[PDB]
């Protein structure tokens, strides 16, 4: 072809048929040099015009840019020298070939272009791009052959082309060096985030993320240490981009109504097709290159089989086994980030779009959804869309992989392959049947789980009563009975989990048995050979994942079809209509009702009926009417929240509104006051003083910076009403709407605010005030009063105008998709579903967990697992010996006995691998369940044994969250992950042993490949663990914020703060985006580094086979290379589990922390008091001291007192009375410091608590009841009969009530006695004390909050029934101790006066001075 061009042959096939095979010189110097040259001139204008599109300010000329510019200048010099050398030299006898000087011409031309673009790249933000990085990469691979050809030719002594050779070597060396400089990013401070400044070789490698990994590992990582997301990923841009497509296409869907449906998906696709297209043209590259590894394996096996194949075939088939894997590696991760980033980019387009719809949504469309049913609309109902939008491509890519794998397998084995794929297909119904069976059992368990929470909250909140009455053994067995019923069901779930795992784990070795046995037995001449044997095993490790993860792509995709419907309904709702209410400035006065009629819903009566009313913009106006008759709707009428049927409302200026129920945000109390406007010291002091928040402010700890809201300190209705009024006043608006501002405030307090805030001289003189109330306290000062009747006004006038005329009417994080780890993609999906059900409602730690597991059972389980690896090793090794039969035994000469022997042994080895892996998982379930039985029991014992001091310090909510919100982790997620870790760490070890037994020298290479693997795992775990908790801590505020704005939405529209609240969500969502995307790259940084090690393991193994080809048999390379191709996927899988195990193991450590809590004195000691010990009340003090905390101070200073039988002891005090301390004193609740108290000749310290505690009675101030029933509440052990219980109820006068109940004692008591009134609950505690019938009664303010009639009843019952028992009474008021035989006075831990109240009153004493003559 190029005879007139090259003067030599273009291509001779004989050149490649020799051991010293070299490409023809003409072919390399022309064809392979145009591919890089043609790559530029074809695409050079495009990358030039696109650069010209973004004309920005050029950065300073960096040193690196100059170096990569002068060096290319040398290439211009070298190319020019070569052209001049060829032409200026005198040789005309032989005409120069065209190739000799034409090639410099393009090199002269192309380097001129490179000089131009490299300078023009400065204007762009990214100093390097795929246009130059690929060209340098492509000009080295194509130019390598010339470098090899010239070097080999020069080594032969032919120096005819020495001048060209030396110039080419320098040109080749500089191109390699230029590539090095092209991988370095020139810092120009365009943005703090390096993603937009990273060079191309640093953006398909993620070396720009190295800074965080290095920074995170050293010191703890914090929010400000993570760079903000790219400008495109910003939530402000995404909402606007999604808004245009949503609004234009929703109207199209509205036209089809002549409720819109099937409209959300058609909008999302039209908005992100530019990202979808880039993930489709690039996914095919991964699928095409994933079948190269098996196809290249056949070539390498054939090379080892024959001793005639040339050496260069092997090396070229080993380099290609690394290049075709690097391209697959870099492209696959460049797709994972290009598609997971779409998941984050689609949730933001919905999470930040529901909020904007929430403000504008009509309440009529909000009536159906509750508060909880709206908060979950994006925490679960929109997070369902991530997983669907995370990896859609398996809807088409999985179909492609199974269809292509079948074709390749059918091309190598024959029709018998259909039987093999049939077995894997038949697994899918087994998986589906087991999955839907496990879900039924799991969800049926959630009802028993939540019941334990209800009791668990119940026990801790009220442990004081539990310690007093010593009832905790009864509840301990009550919870254990519930837990035992729980654990019996849990074990069945674990059994169903050791089968799905066993079926899925065994399916790659069962298909091999079926496929090979049928192939060899169907026909005699079908001999098995290593070329067609191991090319099938490695294909079964490729087809397995698409055909096992496909069924979840049907359930999950269908699971979004219902989740989309809820999102479809909400976004499609009709927004509120503001045509009824007008805002204008031309209007003179403030208010105007033009025959307005209003109704709550369309199918309802009009609450407002045809009223004309006008108000001047200068006075206070109040509205008075009967409660529940067209009154509460009036305030909402001038707000846009209320529906209109016929009317015309106009309002001038801003409006301020105060609701009946108070909506309060979380944060400091200052934010709820200023409302995010400003902070004026003079104004702030005015509203705070006028609104009288000072009597509260000194009471909340932290002063004005207290944590208000559910997060911190809750407030009563009265304080909440004041805050809402204070917020409105500070805003300083025009019109104020008051809706019962003084409904729940104190009467005297209500006097204070009315006069000075909104009265004759209040700060609101210049602002109109509309007020509604039913209390007749203050309406003499109101400028104008309007009386409503039948929903309309009846009389208008002031108090003296017309009213005086008559006056008669007045988890799962770090795994974005199951695609990243297809080794076990099933257990991942169940883990997310466990989390979704939830949201709808160092080495010493491992040993501690393993000690909970039967340690004897551990050594057998690990023995079964390691024996499984041996069987796997034996099976593959035996298969290698089987394929050796083809060489020795000719076709049609294969003995039938030998054929039957081969399959028979392989069948048994398919069973030794089967019967052992099942006996390990099956025994894993019986062990992991037993751990939960022991671990939970330890917590329920020590915690119930914990001192009252322990509960006082730590919050109650902390313990509960660690009782079942943490136990769920140790027995749903931890057991399944651990059994899925050792089953893969034994895959890496098994694979490495396989290679080491073929080429022993390879084990040296393991050490560099072990240090790298450990270092990468160590770095990633030390960082991604921090990045996991840092996401959860910042994800919760988004959902928490939405609950506070959907509930307080009517207030928001009153102040027109919609725009401010939207911006609050933009920053709040963005802070989550900068964290979710922050580990996605951190997850990709694992894959590239580890697949680089996985590729190096395979590449360095193929060289060992190639080099040691004289001794290695052809079939031996099969089981060494077929099982090594799976090391790439297993290697990154192993590290991910180690991250999740190391994160979920903190749950066990937290449990152990409370299990080690210091424990009180033994319940039962060697001394048991006789029944006559509580027979008489002999209480004596011996200078006893008490201490709340062993380090603060001494509460008691050695009180000494003698108490005889029938001594009505009255103990009183003002400050530090120790009345609480005395209750903890007599019952051994606290520790004994310097004294002791002797009872009936026996010291309390000697007696065991449980025997001691039961023998006295106590009535707590707070009557907390129990949720079981009344029968168990009165008596947990229930040793008493029904007649005694009925008599006790009669004694407490509950007989008439309980007998009138539904079933009496069998009545279902709700939480905290929610079905019983406060006065009712205060009578149960008397019955509880009545049942004891013991001589000692300790009282502690049981009548501080009871009515007088019941108060007289309560003491009389104590006076009458316990007239035969010693009673010690504690009362804050001295009006209940005149009936006391002995009255005790003490202050700050020291007794003041001793004596009866009769003699105490005669002598003027300190208690007489402060309580009798001054307190009376």
Author numbering: 1 to 258, 305 to 856, 884 to 914, 963 to 1537
What did the original publication write about this model?
Bilirubin is conjugated in hepatocytes and excreted to bile duct via the ATP-binding cassette transporter ABCC2, dysfunction of which would lead to Dubin-Johnson syndrome. ABCC2 is a 180 kDa full transporter of 1545 residues that structurally consists of two half modules, which are predicted to be the transmembrane domain (TMD) and a cytoplasmic nucleotide-binding domain (NBD), respectively. Notably, ABCC2 also has an extra N-terminal TMD0, which exists mainly in ABCC family and was suggested to participate in the subcellular localization. Here we determine the structures of ABCC2 in the apo, substrate-bound and ATP/ADP-bound forms using the cryo-electron microscopy, exhibiting a full transporter with a regulatory (R) domain inserted between the two half modules.
The apo-form structure of ABCC2 shows an inward-facing (IF) conformation. In the translocation cavity, we found an extra density that could be fitted by the N- and M-segment of the R domain, in which only the side chains of the M-segment can be well fitted due to a relatively higher local resolution. The M-segment is folded into a short helix and a loop, occupying the translocation cavity, whereas the densities of the C-segment are untraceable in the map. The M-segment of the R domain is fixed in translocation cavity via abundant hydrogen bonds and salt bridges with the residues from TMD1 and TMD2. Specifically, Glu892 from the loop of the M-segment forms a hydrogen bond with Tyr381 from TMD1. In addition, Glu893 forms a hydrogen bond with Asn1204 and two salt bridges with Arg1205 and Arg1257 of TMD2, respectively. Arg904 from the helix forms a salt bridge with Glu1261 of TMD2. To investigate the function of the M-segment that binds to the translocation cavity, we generated the variants E892Q and E893Q for ATPases activity assays. Interestingly, both variants displayed a significant increase of ATPase activity compared to the wild type. We further performed the transport activity assays using radioisotope-labeled substrate E217βG and found that E892Q and E893Q also exhibited a significant increase of transport activity. Thus, these results indicated that the R domain binding to the translocation cavity functions as an auto-inhibitor of ABCC2.
